[PDB]
Amino acid sequence: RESYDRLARELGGYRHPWARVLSGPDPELTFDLWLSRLLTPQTRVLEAGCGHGPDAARFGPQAARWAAYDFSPELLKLARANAPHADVYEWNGKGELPAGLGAPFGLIVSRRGPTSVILRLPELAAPDAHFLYVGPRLNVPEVPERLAAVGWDIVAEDHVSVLAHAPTWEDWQMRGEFMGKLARRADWDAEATVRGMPYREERHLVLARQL
Numbered sequence: 001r002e003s004y005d006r007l008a009r010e011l012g013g014y015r016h017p018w019a020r021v022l023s024g025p026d027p028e029l030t031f032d033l034w035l036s037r038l039l040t041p042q043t044r045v046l047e048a049g050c051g052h053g054p055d056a057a058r059f060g061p062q063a064a065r066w067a068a069y070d071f072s073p074e075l076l077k078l079a080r081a082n083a084p085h086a087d088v089y090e091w092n093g094k095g096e097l098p099a100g101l102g103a104p105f106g107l108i109v110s111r112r113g114p115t116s117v118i119l120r121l122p123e124l125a126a127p128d129a130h131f132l133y134v135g136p137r138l139n140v141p142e143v144p145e146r147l148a149a150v151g152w153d154i155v156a157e158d159h160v161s162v163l164a165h166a167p168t169w170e171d172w173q174m175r176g177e178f179m180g181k182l183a184r185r186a187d188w189d190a191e192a193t194v195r196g197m198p199y200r201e202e203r204h205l206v207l208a209r210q211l
């Protein structure tokens with residue numbers, strides 16, 4: 001059904017869509033650790049691009065308040081149910097802030113989400129707030145550039161890379177589409193092992209603050 005594809009696109013919006021097996025540690029483990037260290041029962045959190053609330057549900061109760069936003073109204077319905085403690089807002093990240101957002105925040109976080117939110121940090125951040133981000137590639141140049149543009153300092157940065165395999169040709173193809181690089185049977189036929197096709201899952205972690 002088409003109702004399934006939509007759902008799948010939506011729940012999967014912040015992940016890679018193809019089947020894959022990691023040969024090493026999940027490259028977002030460090031991001032989870034850093035996020036966990038930053039949360040206290042006094043912390044006011046803003047999460048950009050919350051999707052169906054997985055992080056709101058999982059880390060949200062550890063904070064004083066977890067405010068979160070995304071664009072899709074139906075997806076936000078799941079987020080509200082997934083995380084009853086969270087305050088969830090429908091926003092495309094542009095123009096004026098949603099009414100009731102509740103700035104200022106001590107933490108602004110984004111897991112592979114919007115990076116334009118960086119340019120709103122002067123309007124969103126309490127003094128001594130942190131901005132925490134992980135991007136779906138080894139280096140996401142706009143993040144450091146945008147943080148420089150608002151006079152924020154990077155206090156921690158990680159460029160992470162982990163061997164993975166796409167177990168089948170179909171999976172390799174699907175990755176090719178997501179990446180905008182067409183998969184070719186030649187490369188599969190010549191380089192695929194029993195594990196399938198090898199590639200790197202890479203992430204760029206950034207923790208910043210205005211010192």
Ligand SMILES: [Cl-]
Binds near residue numbers: 054
């Ligand atoms: Cl989930």
